[PDB]
Amino acid sequence: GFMGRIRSVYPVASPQECNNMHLSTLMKCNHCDEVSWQTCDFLKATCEHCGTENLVIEGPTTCGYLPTNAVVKMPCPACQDPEIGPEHSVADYHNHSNIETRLRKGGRTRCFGGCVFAYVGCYNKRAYWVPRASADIGSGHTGITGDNVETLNEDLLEILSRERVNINIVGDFHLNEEVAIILASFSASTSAFIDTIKSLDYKSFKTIVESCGNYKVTKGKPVKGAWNIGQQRSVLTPLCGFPSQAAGVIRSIFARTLDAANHSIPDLQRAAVTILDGISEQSLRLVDAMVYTSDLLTNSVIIMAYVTGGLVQQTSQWLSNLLGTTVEKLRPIFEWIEAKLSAGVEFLKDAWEILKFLITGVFDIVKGQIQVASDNIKDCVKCFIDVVNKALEMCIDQVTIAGAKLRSLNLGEVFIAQSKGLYRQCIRGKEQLQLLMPLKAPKEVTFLEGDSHDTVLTSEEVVLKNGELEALETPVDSFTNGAIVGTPVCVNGLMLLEIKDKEQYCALSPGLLATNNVFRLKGG
């Protein structure tokens, strides 16, 4: 506010070095009829569910952890009104502030959740108040003041009066709301928090929380007498009353409630977008960082609706990247997804789970079909994978390399899919190739490009041979756990790596490494 008065409070050079406090009262919201801790100033509170501004009514209140250079900013009626204006006297503020005050020996004060606030001045038509006295139940928390407060107050006390508060992750470590708002408590801007929240894991959560706080972080699954992080606890609780801006965004995002009603998912998505943008210009990028890079667990409708809308584009991207081609022949997959997204809330959590598979799922491509690696694949995901595999099976045909017929996959580029991996049929000419070619044989040698196991090359003598070919389903690692070593052979015009005692041969790649497709010679 006025620089001289603020500097008598804090060793502060500019009003912007002052940190806003988190104030909240437990009260019902007329619009949503729910009783929730609502963020507020001295007179107005906002529902974190409804998002509607309300008038503070008597109830338990708290100021949360007190930050450095703490202030409570409020719109100034006097500064806003045209007649009185930005220049006004301390007592003229108090007349139109419509904030009832108690007169102490130091001057007018106002109390809130165990802090006594004093008015320093207006600045940019906003009043600044500072806490002249502030309780501490430990870790800077101001405690709760109200009628049935001790039950909650005693829990808070046991976690917080410790020199080092103990964070205990009870199960497996996962990004949920409580973890997010604890990390957010350390970030001076929402933008900064975005970068820190990426690729989060127990170690990084441990190093960050411990470096920047009086915390000790334990992953003992068995719970202790301190702050236990299990699952599904709201960030709308005084223990999570951190005052920073990022924490404020995270608390709002995870508290909004959108009624899915009979709306389709792309409708809820458009609704989600506007709700999220009003919270913060960074919130879309914040949720994206949390969902796509740190495996956020939540049941929030807004967060789920924001990311799962679209979905076809995210699915096409996922498909194009692992098939290495355009996926417009796979049209059936996208119609199905459009259809299920139109169902609305019914499909919402299945959309959520499909998305998470696209991001972190573990599979291989075998005989032109996706094969997942885990049997805890959810029922909604098994159904989705079988939608995809049925679309691929429409694109399956037969290519015949000279000597044998091999399973094809016509996807705007023909791929070979007899075995694990998708193989291009790139032919490079013997001209200039590293290994010397007898040129006895036609220069119709074929390579096949794709996933390649490391190879050792005993001798570079090339050995032509002929006879008919057999296509074999067997994987190379099944017969070769160790790196495969061999001397090249060309049968009818493509390099098949060979070891003589084994009756099997494997195809070669540009760069001369071995591949999964494997063949044998007629009659063994």
Closer by beta carbon to Zn ion, 51 or else 332: 51
Residue found by looking up tokens 């009603």 in the block: 261
Which residues, 215 to 254, sit near Zn ion by CB under 5 A? none
Regarding 118 and contact with Zn ion (CB under 5 A), the answer is no
The annotation status of 76 as a binding-site residue, yes or no, is yes
The annotation status of 122 as a binding-site residue, yes or no, is yes
Regarding 93 and contact with Zn ion (CB under 5 A), the answer is yes
For the CB of residue 143, give the shortest distance to Zn ion in the complex, in Å. 25
Q: Of 6, 27, 39, 49, which lies in the binding site for Zn ion, with binding defined by CB under 5 A?
A: 49
Closer by beta carbon to Zn ion, 130 or else 291: 130
Query: What DSSP state is assigned to residue 492?
Result: S
Q: Of 70, 122, 304, 497, which lies in the binding site for Zn ion, with binding defined by CB under 5 A?
A: 122
The DSSP result for 261-326, as a single string, is TT--HHHHHHHHHHHHHHH-TTHHHHHHHHHHHH------HHHHHHHHSS-HHHHHHHHHHHHTS-
Closer by beta carbon to Zn ion, 94 or else 132: 94
Query: What DSSP state is assigned to residue 239?
Result: G
**Both tokens of residue 478?**
């099944």
CB-CB neighbours of 470 under 10 Å: 17
Cβ proximity of 275 and 256 under 8 Å? yes
Which of 416, 485, 430 is CA-nearest to residue 454?
A: 485
Count of residues interacting with Zn ion (CB under 5 A): 10
Regarding 79 and contact with Zn ion (CB under 5 A), the answer is yes
For the CB of residue 97, give the shortest distance to Zn ion in the complex, in Å. 7
**Both tokens of residue 406?**
């091999």
Question: From CA 15, how far away is CA 4, in angstroms rounded?
Answer: 11
Cβ proximity of 43 and 77 under 8 Å? no
Regarding 84 and contact with Zn ion (CB under 5 A), the answer is no
The annotation status of 40 as a binding-site residue, yes or no, is no
For the CB of residue 88, give the shortest distance to Zn ion in the complex, in Å. 5
Regarding 47 and contact with Zn ion (CB under 5 A), the answer is yes
Closer by beta carbon to Zn ion, 47 or else 152: 47
Cβ proximity of 203 and 152 under 8 Å? no
Cβ proximity of 428 and 447 under 8 Å? yes
Q: Applying CB under 5 A, which part among 25-33, 183-191, 392-400, 418-426 lies near Zn ion? A: 25-33
- Checking DSSP bridges between strand 404-410 and strand 19-20, what pairing results, if any? unpaired
For the CB of residue 308, give the shortest distance to Zn ion in the complex, in Å. 25
**Both tokens of residue 378?**
């959810």
The annotation status of 29 as a binding-site residue, yes or no, is yes
The annotation status of 395 as a binding-site residue, yes or no, is no
For the CB of residue 231, give the shortest distance to Zn ion in the complex, in Å. 24
Which of 466, 496, 473, 474 is CA-nearest to residue 403?
A: 466
Q: Of 45, 50, 137, 255, which lies in the binding site for Zn ion, with binding defined by CB under 5 A?
A: 50
Q: Applying CB under 5 A, which part among 114-122, 314-322, 492-500, 511-519 lies near Zn ion? A: 114-122
Regarding 32 and contact with Zn ion (CB under 5 A), the answer is yes
Element of type H or E holding 113: none
Question: From CA 6, how far away is CA 233, in angstroms rounded?
Answer: 38
Kindly give, in sequence order, each residue whose CB lies less than 8 Å from that of residue 4, ignoring residues fewer than 6 positions away: none
Query: What DSSP state is assigned to residue 328?
Result: G
Regarding 272 and contact with Zn ion (CB under 5 A), the answer is no
For the CB of residue 235, give the shortest distance to Zn ion in the complex, in Å. 16
Q: What is the binding site for Zn ion (CB under 5 A)?
A: 29, 32, 47, 49-50, 76, 78-79, 93, 122
Q: Where is the binding site, in residues?
A: 29, 32, 47, 50, 76, 79, 88, 122
